[PDB]
Nucleic acid binder design. Structure first.
Lengths: 80, 136, 156, 130
RNA sequence: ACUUAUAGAUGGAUCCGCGCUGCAUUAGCUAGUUGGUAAGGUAACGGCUUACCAAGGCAACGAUGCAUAGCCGACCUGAGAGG
RNA sequence: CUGACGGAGCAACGCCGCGUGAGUGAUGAAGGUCUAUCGUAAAACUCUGUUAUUAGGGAGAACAUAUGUCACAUCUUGACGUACCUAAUCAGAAAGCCACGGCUAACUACGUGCCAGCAGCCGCGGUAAUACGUAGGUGGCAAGCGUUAUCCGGAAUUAUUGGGCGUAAAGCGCGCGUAGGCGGUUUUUUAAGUCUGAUGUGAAAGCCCACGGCUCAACCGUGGAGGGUCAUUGGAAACUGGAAAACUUG
RNA sequence: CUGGUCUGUAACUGACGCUGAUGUGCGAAAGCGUGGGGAUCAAACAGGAUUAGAUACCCUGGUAGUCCACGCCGUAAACGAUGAGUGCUAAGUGUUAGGGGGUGCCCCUUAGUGCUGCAGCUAACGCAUUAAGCACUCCGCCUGGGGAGUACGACCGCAAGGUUGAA
């Protein structure tokens, strides 16, 4: 039983690695059936690196080792 | 009939209100606020007798009852039948709802019902305005 | 013989320069128990032989159920205005379900074995039309393939 | 022009209303599939493929049968961009107890309503043409 | 028949997930909103009180408030979705 | 020690186990709506134990250092412990039914002269209530008569299957117009997903089923339907999907 | 002074994206902003007059307004009660400045309108090569009637006021 390759994109950040990655998925509602796409926000972190202005990455579900943040993974696409 | 804005924006059902809103209720005094109950059975204790004259559709004469329910409000009744209970101050079994042709009244009497028995001029009814122990 | 069951018995009058004239509006069902029923416009003021007055002129308009073996081969929810009916095949002993005088064009056809309901309307002036169109959209077991352009066994 | 076949579909039945044929229509790579696999059942006068680039031109030339009556009595698509309804190849429905046919793309090449039932292949199964 | 290096286990669960309802008469967003950085400590990582600094983190997507507040084999029940 | 679990006045609350009349009977009366009707009414004869005089009432079931040497055991288990109670068995009645026409399923009328008054949507008495006061019952019934009100398919008056546009009960003041629902042609780089699936095949008492214990009904059980991408990620690029462009007349 | 509209094909670029709740909003005399405010008619009505029945649609005249270059708007039968992408099964026809072939002579939509109206649907009706019919569309409303916008109400706002909302 291993740990996924959760991915996403980035929006903004604050002092000394208040890092994050975006979360999203393909799925629908149970009632009126439309392919409307949807999202919710996450909490990863680095030293200062995985951050705003382009950090398309991966994330994890592990021991956070964090305040209320939860992730340790960054497996990327590219940078800007 | 387009489904995009249907989870954006929903629809309604019809619009209806149930029957006898000031009924199926037992008024508080300890906590002062009513109970939404829909009880099977209930009582009726009397304040007046009551009668209004102008009847077009029938165009005969017959009175009704003005019986107050709990603790200061107007509650009104009617006696559908050929039996006149020249009485008051009773303790009864309620009948819920209105019979045809009287507006606003929704409260009635079961045959017998602990107060009296009924108009004893009936013996064929065996099941109307007081009729117990009737040879079938 | 037609089982000559009275369909519907309706009153109108025509207001005049004197005492208005009543009449009785009626027809008859003309049922071979094979699938067709027509009607006679027995426009008159008599109740019992308006049944007969439709047995007179009925045969101008009867149309066929392209019968399948106690059934219909394909499924229908049509209507030529409002009155609609739903029709399907079914096992040849099913129980019979119907509304008005279309107990005289479902129970009097080469089927009897359905799940048939009248979708929406069910009146003496819609049940007929409802079932009439239901039956006008049918076909036998060897003829779609020609306006199509093959043999029918070329669909499964 | 976002669906390159959309109205063109029922334009069969909305062109042959009184069994008529003067309607030339535009193309696709499935307007090299819409009118090419029911000629498998003698349904068209001629659509051999589209002979142009840029998804061009095509004579619709809708064959009409021997009873004079609507080769295509009625017809709807139930598969359009904006209406995406995807089902499996098992309970592909009974298209008027099997009286109609379907011609559609699959998850393993190209099939019909004669293949989904005996190959377990297909995606957005489209319509009921009769 | 005593006390220990050790155990299979007990309610649990340190916790992960989808389980996890309504009120638009409630969006310019809480100062901890973003998350890294503590002497600490619960069989249990860690803004959990504290440890250090910058917020526009928000952002017109429900932040948040917010009203009944158990769920789940049960029962009448649909053809079936289940409701 | 049970006050955890047990022993029950039992409420005709659930509904059943069935018992309160028989072989019945010529049309049979002294006739109760109508003026032949329910009259095959009746009687006075016989049939069943099953209610009732008694009786013996022992249904389940295996308990235990020393008995000799966690598999385990005798000289150790009847308040309800009396049930199945065939039991001869007399005759130990199964209250009473509604509206009383036609729909909700009902039969006719004297009372009634609009005085009281009938009435589940429809609906009735002013001088023939085929409604009412009341009176012998046919449609349903015998542990059952009118009522009490909750969501179910029915309600297709949610529209997930099953929603109107000019008109019921409904369309943009529009130049404007963020988010995004949707969002050209062809090849597409994708190799995720759907095609669907090897696998995991991890239990269910019962499942899409049925059946076996049981005076049949209150009270228990084989589980072949794998436990519902659960312990592995797929091959079909035909595409919403890391997304390179070309076509142009739109 | 002033754009587009584009009527013919499209020179350039090789998708050059559709309903459009963010915003902005803005839209009839009057209601609204300058003092002009009378050419003086029209409200009130001064006033007569009436069949049995008039301050009156009638009647000369009569104080906002009737003669407006500046703040912002919005209720009307916006009765246009028609919401906008894709074509469409006879085309003619009235024809439009302006035109594909052309040359006060015959025209077709790359076009435009109003249509008699084939053809086929909707629901009784109407649309129709120049479509409510059939196919991909969004803000959505509607899903038997009132009363009901009356407790009460939330937010715009110079003003009519809006714009909300259980019983």
């Amino acid at each position: 039983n291993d740990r996924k390759v959760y991915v996403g994109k980035v929006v903004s950040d604050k002092m000394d690695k208040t890092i994050t990655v975006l979360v999203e998925t393909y799925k629908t509602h149970k009632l009126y059936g439309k392919r409307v796409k949807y999202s919710k926000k996450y909490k990863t972190h680095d030293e200062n690196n995985s951050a705003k202005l382009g950090d398309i990455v991966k994330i994890q579900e592990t021991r956070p080792l964090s305040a209320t943040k939860r992730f340790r993974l960054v497996e990327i696409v590219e940078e800007s | 009939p387009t489904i995009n804005q249907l989870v954006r924006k929903p629809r309604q059902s019809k619009i209806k209100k149930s029957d006898s809103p000031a009924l199926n209720k037992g008024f508080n005094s300890k906590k002062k606020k009513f109970t939404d109950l829909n009880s099977p059975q209930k009582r009726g204790v009397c304040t007046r007798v009551g009668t209004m004259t102008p009847k077009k559709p029938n165009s005969a004469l017959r009175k009704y009852a003005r019986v107050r329910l709990s603790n200061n409000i107007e509650i009104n009744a009617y006696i559908p039948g050929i039996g006149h209970n020249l009485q008051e101050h009773s303790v009864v079994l309620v009948r819920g709802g209105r019979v045809k042709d009287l507006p606003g009244v929704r409260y009635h009497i079961v045959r017998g019902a602990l107060d009296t028995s009924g108009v004893d001029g009936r013996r064929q009814g065996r099941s109307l305005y007081g009729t117990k122990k009737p040879k079938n | 013989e037609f089982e000559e069951r009275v369909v519907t018995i309706n009153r109108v009058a025509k207001v005049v320069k004197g005492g208005r004239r009543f009449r009785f509006t009626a027809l008859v069902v003309v049922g071979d128990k094979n699938g067709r029923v027509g009607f006679g416009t027995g426009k008159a003021q008599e109740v019992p032989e308006a049944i007969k007055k439709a047995v007179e002129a009925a045969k101008k308009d009867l149309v066929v159920v392209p019968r399948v073996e106690g059934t219909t081969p394909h499924t229908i929810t049509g209507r030529y205005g409002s009155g609609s009916v739903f029709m399907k095949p079914a096992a040849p002993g099913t129980g019979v379900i119907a509304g008005g005088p279309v107990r005289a064009v479902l129970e009097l056809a080469g089927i009897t074995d359905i799940l048939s309901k009248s979708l929406g309307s069910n009146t003496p002036i819609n049940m007929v039309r409802a079932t009439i169109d239901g039956l006008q959209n049918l076909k036998n077991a060897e003829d779609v393939a020609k306006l199509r352009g093959k043999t029918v066994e070329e669909l499964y | 022009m976002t669906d390159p076949i959309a109205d063109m579909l029922t334009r069969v039945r909305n062109a042959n209303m009184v069994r008529h044929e003067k309607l030339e229509l535009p193309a696709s790579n499935i307007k090299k599939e819409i009118a090419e696999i029911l000629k498998s059942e003698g349904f068209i006068k001629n659509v051999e493929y589209v002979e142009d680039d840029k998804q061009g031109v095509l004579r619709l030339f809708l064959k009409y049968g021997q009873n004079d009556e609507r080769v295509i009595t009625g017809l709807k698509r139930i598969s359009k961009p904006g209406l995406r309804v995807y089902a499996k190849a098992s309970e592909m429905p009974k298209v008027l107890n099997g009286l109609g046919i379907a011609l559609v793309s699959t998850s393993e090449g190209v099939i019909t309503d004669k293949e989904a039932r005996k190959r377990n292949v297909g995606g957005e199964i489209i319509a009921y043409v009769w």
